[PDB]
Design an enzyme around this catalytic site. Structure first.
Site, PDB file in Angstrom:
ATOM      1  CB  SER A 111       0.257  -8.000  -0.997  1.00 19.47           C
ATOM      2  OG  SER A 111      -0.618  -8.761  -0.181  1.00 19.47           O
ATOM      3  CE  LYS A 161      -4.110  -2.019   0.438  1.00 18.11           C
ATOM      4  NZ  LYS A 161      -5.254  -1.897  -0.504  1.00 18.11           N
ATOM      5  CD  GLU A 167     -10.233   3.380   1.129  1.00 11.53           C
ATOM      6  OE1 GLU A 167     -10.309   4.611   0.968  1.00 11.53           O
ATOM      7  OE2 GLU A 167      -9.531   2.666   0.386  1.00 11.53           O
TER       8      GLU A 167
END
Ligand SMILES: Cc1ncc(COP(=O)(O)O)c(C/N=C(\CNc2ccccc2O)C(=O)O)c1O
Ligand SMILES: O=P(O)(O)OCCNS(=O)(=O)c1ccc(OC(F)(F)F)cc1
Ligand SMILES: Nc1ccccc1O
Ligand SMILES: [Cl-]
Ligand SMILES: [Cl-]
Ligand SMILES: [Cl-]
Ligand SMILES: [Cl-]
Ligand SMILES: [Cl-]
Ligand SMILES: [Cl-]
Ligand SMILES: [Cl-]
Ligand SMILES: [Cs+]
Ligand SMILES: [Cs+]
Lengths: 395, 268
Positions: A376, A86, A108
């Site tokens: 990830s 991210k 969010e």
């Protein structure tokens, strides 16, 4: 009127209230301008390398494939600053927010990884950051609520609906529709209204570019397939993008199967939903026969989302990418296997991608295949949740 | 039909504005909702804006979010909403009825089929809150094919191109947004809308109704003086439902007094 195509085939678009169209058009223009701007690109590259730690390693996982003809590499986004992929696109969007003169960030989060990434980028770059997080996710991913508030971000629990990621998305968009002159909405996935699916892909595509160069250096050829979990779509499209034109390379996205697709308690709209309009996009939705948006379910908060980004729906429709699902229990086994046999604690989200790769190997153990899993994120945020589950199993 | 056109022609002759309440269909229940709507009309509502309960109403603040939840707790479905609309039109042949829709409910079983069903039950207009003009083509085309007015939003940040499009594409009435944000009585509009109201008239747009945050009679009068043809009030109405759930008699009495006062404000 837009500068870029808002659709991937029939999927995508800008299904937001009229009030928000200038904000989307401004964001699109700033992105197109920045992508041509050598100074922006150099700032972005500087942050990725010297602050976030790019390039990330590509790890060859030898123990867990022993006795099969599978060679498995893990792309180590778990080693990125913040602990998940991210961070990549947050750094680019924060630079876009500054380019547009925004002083505040709305984000969010469900896995809290995008919240942490948004908070750390805002602390670094001088933005006032407020995070919406479902109250259920506040609990099952609490190590990240601690991280976000230490870095100065405001964290707002959302009790509405399922009290999970979908509900946090709703409140972030509601907030943005009344604060867009001063706040940039740092959407955390490759979904939502145009231009977010395009921007998020382009700001994640270094995952696949690096993977390609690394696999070529180590193996002299392209992977047979690259495999990534799909919550909204960002880590998967980041891995996929640079391979889309390499037609020999399989693109496999893994949706959460939750308690099992047949229970309806899952997060797999791409393969088990149907096209609808929600969260600013036309995309596969979990929805009732009446057209109400369902609540999703996954053991993994980061995959607990009842829709999916439009480029994945498109790549599926034309057969370029294949999508599968992995249940809670399959993900948990893969989590345990990576901890015990490679010494890597993966995010439960990423564990869904791993689980499918392990299935590809185990189902056909004499099939020669070179596979990459996008790891990830790291699993520190999950260790308490996994503890309580295995304790209740007597393990 | 021509219910908006006839309404605004009659209102102009009486030199007055429209007052248009909004409620959620089936809040707090089907039959209490039907009585609420009859009370709004008997108290002087010129037209109705009616919401179909939706799971994720992203243009609505807490007051109307909770109205949606109350209707879902009563088990209200879009199919039951169309049954209600038929009963309302059966009692009230001339009042203009506009729906507040979210896109997925219109798209769900086919856009054309949705507007055909609106035509069959006697609906006059449809506003799809998360479809901007940029995405509106199949919605407005299906609306016009079924004699339904497609309602477009003119936001405060509207430029000249948007004014011309909304003027050309829209029918029935132009929705003049008071402010950014979501629905709610706690937050009143800040900007003056005089320049947009007059550009809309220049481009022969459908008459403008102001909405978002209208909760007091002064606001209704101020919208009419500014040049708008009237005003819409939702959260202020819905708050009266919420506050009186345990007393349906005092609910209808307080709705009647409020609507009456809001309508009286539109007469000068
Ligand atoms: C390590 C890791 N790996 C994969 C994923 C899955 O997300 P993807 O890579 O975007 O598909 C997550 C998702 N995490 C979210 C959910 N983020 C999120 C998901 C869907 C809509 C909005 C969102 O903010 C978060 O907010 O941190 C993750 O943390
Ligand atoms: O009085 P308030 O503040 O509750 O406002 C009531 C408005 N109810 S409505 O159906 O007109 C209405 C109109 C438009 C909406 O969204 C959109 F602008 F994006 F289209 C939402 C509701
Ligand atoms: N295809 C496309 C390209 C640029 C702008 C708008 C578009 O629809
Ligand atoms: Cl360049
Ligand atoms: Cl190259
Ligand atoms: Cl292959
Ligand atoms: Cl008049
Ligand atoms: Cl909601
Ligand atoms: Cl409930
Ligand atoms: Cl506001
Ligand atoms: Cs091997
Ligand atoms: Cs999902």
């Amino acid at each position: 009127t837009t500068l870029l195509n808002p659709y991937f085939g029939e999927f995508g678009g800008m299904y937001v209230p009229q009030i928000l169209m200038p904000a989307l058009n401004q964001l699109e223009e700033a992105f197109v301008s920045a992508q041509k701007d050598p100074e922006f690109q150099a700032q972005f590259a500087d942050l990725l390398k010297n602050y976030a730690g790019r390039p990330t390693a590509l790890t060859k996982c030898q123990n867990i494939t022993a006795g099969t003809r599978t060679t498995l590499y893990l792309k180590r986004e778990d080693l990125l600053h913040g602990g998940a992929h991210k961070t990549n696109q947050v750094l680019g969007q924060a630079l876009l927010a500054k380019r547009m003169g925004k002083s505040e960030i709305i984000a969010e989060t469900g896995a809290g990884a995008h919240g942490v990434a948004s908070a750390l980028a805002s602390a670094l770059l001088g933005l006032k950051c407020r995070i919406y997080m479902g109250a259920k996710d506040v609990e099952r991913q609490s190590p990240n609520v601690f991280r976000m508030r230490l870095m100065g971000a405001e964290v707002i629990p959302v009790h509405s609906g399922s009290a999970t990621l979908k509900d946090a998305c709703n409140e972030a968009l509601r907030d943005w529709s009344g604060s867009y002159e001063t706040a940039h909405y740092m959407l955390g996935t490759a979904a939502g209204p145009h231009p977010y699916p395009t921007i998020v892909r382009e700001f994640q595509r270094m995952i696949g570019e690096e993977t390609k160069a690394q696999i070529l250096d180590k193996e002299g050829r392209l992977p047979d397939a690259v495999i990534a979990c799909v919550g909204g779509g960002s880590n998967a499209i980041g891995m996929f993008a640079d391979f889309i034109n390499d037609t020999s390379v399989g693109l496999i996205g893994v949706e959460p199967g939750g308690h099992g697709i047949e229970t309806g308690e899952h997060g797999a709209p791409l393969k088990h939903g149907r096209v609808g309009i929600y969260f600013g996009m036309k995309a596969p939705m979990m929805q009732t026969a009446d057209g109400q948006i369902e609540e999703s379910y996954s053991i993994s908060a980061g995959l607990d989302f009842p829709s999916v980004g439009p480029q994945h729906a498109y790549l599926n429709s034309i057969g370029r990418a294949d999508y599968v699902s992995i249940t809670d229990d399959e993900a948990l086994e893969a989590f345990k296997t990576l901890c015990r046999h490679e010494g890597i604690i993966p995010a439960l989200e990423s564990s869904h991608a791993l689980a499918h790769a392990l299935k590809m190997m185990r189902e056909q153990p004499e099939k020669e295949q070179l596979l990459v899993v996008n790891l990830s994120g790291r699993g520190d945020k999950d260790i308490f949740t996994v503890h309580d589950i295995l304790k209740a199993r007597g393990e | 039909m021509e219910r908006y056109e006839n309404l605004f022609a009659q209102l102009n002759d009486r030199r007055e504005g429209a007052f248009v309440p909004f409620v959620t269909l089936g809040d707090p229940g089907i039959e209490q909702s039907l009585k609420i709507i009859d009370t709004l009309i008997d108290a002087g509502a010129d037209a109705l804006e009616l919401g179909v309960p939706f799971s994720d109403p992203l243009a609505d603040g807490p007051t109307i979010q909770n109205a949606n939840l109350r209707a879902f707790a009563a088990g209200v479905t879009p199919a039951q909403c169309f049954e209600m609309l038929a009963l309302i039109r059966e009692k009230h042949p001339t009042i203009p009825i506009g729906l507040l829709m979210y896109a997925n409910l219109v798209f769900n079983n086919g856009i054309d089929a949705f507007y055909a069903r609106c035509e069959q039950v006697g609906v006059d207009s449809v506003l799809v809150a998360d479809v901007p003009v940029e995405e509106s083509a199949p919605f407005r085309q299906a609306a016009l094919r079924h004699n339904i007015a497609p309602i477009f939003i003119c936001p405060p940040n509207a430029d000249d191109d948007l004014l011309r499009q909304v003027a050309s594409y829209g029918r029935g009435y132009t929705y003049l947004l008071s402010r950014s944000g979501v629905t709610g009585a706690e937050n009143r509009g800040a900007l003056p809308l005089h320049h947009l109201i007059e550009k809309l008239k220049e481009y022969h747009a459908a008459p403008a109704l102001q909405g978002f945050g209208i909760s007091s009679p002064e606001q209704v009068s101020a919208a009419v003086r500014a040049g708008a043809a009237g005003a819409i009030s939702g959260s202020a109405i819905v708050k009266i439902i919420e506050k009186n759930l345990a007393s349906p008699k005092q609910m209808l009495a307080e709705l009647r007094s409020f609507v009456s006062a809001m309508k009286a404000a539109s007469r000068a």
